[PDB]
């Protein structure tokens, strides 16, 4: 567009849910599930199952 004409996103949202978020949460949700399946188990085989 011409000069002196910018833009800005009003305003939806700031970071979504199945977008970006869902990853990061699920990510850690694995990270722990494995850890605590070892706090009662002892191996490197049990958790994978």
């Amino acid at each position: 567009l011409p000069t002196g004409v910018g833009y800005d996103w009003t305003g939806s949202y700031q970071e979504r849910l199945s977008g970006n978020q869902a990853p990061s949460l699920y990510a850690i949700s694995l990270i722990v599930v494995f850890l605590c399946l070892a706090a009662l188990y002892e191996s490197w085989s049990i958790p994978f199952s």
Partner: protein, 86 residues
């Protein structure tokens, strides 16, 4: 617990285990599927949200027992992962 405290059961401990506990896997799961039943259909106007929930758990309990108790891992797994090497 069998592999340990009791005896090895290279493949006869994983087998000996569900030989005595298929009961609660299909007692829970069947009782769960049926508790979810009233939301998936039956009701259909008060809260249509009920359909969104129960549809995606009947789906993932049918395929979380008829499979997990069977065919694809949860037996199969421990075999190669624990055994097969170290």
């Amino acid at each position: 617990d069998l592999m340990d405290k009791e005896g090895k059961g290279l493949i006869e401990a994983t087998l000996d285990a569900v030989r005595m506990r298929l009961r609660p896997i299909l007692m829970t799961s069947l009782a769960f599927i049926l508790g979810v039943m009233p939301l998936v259909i039956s009701t259909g106007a008060g809260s249509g949200a009920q359909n969104a929930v129960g549809t995606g758990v009947m789906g993932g309990m049918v395929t979380a027992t008829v499979l997990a108790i069977f065919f694809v891992p949860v037996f199969f797994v421990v075999v190669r992962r624990r055994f097969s090497r170290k």
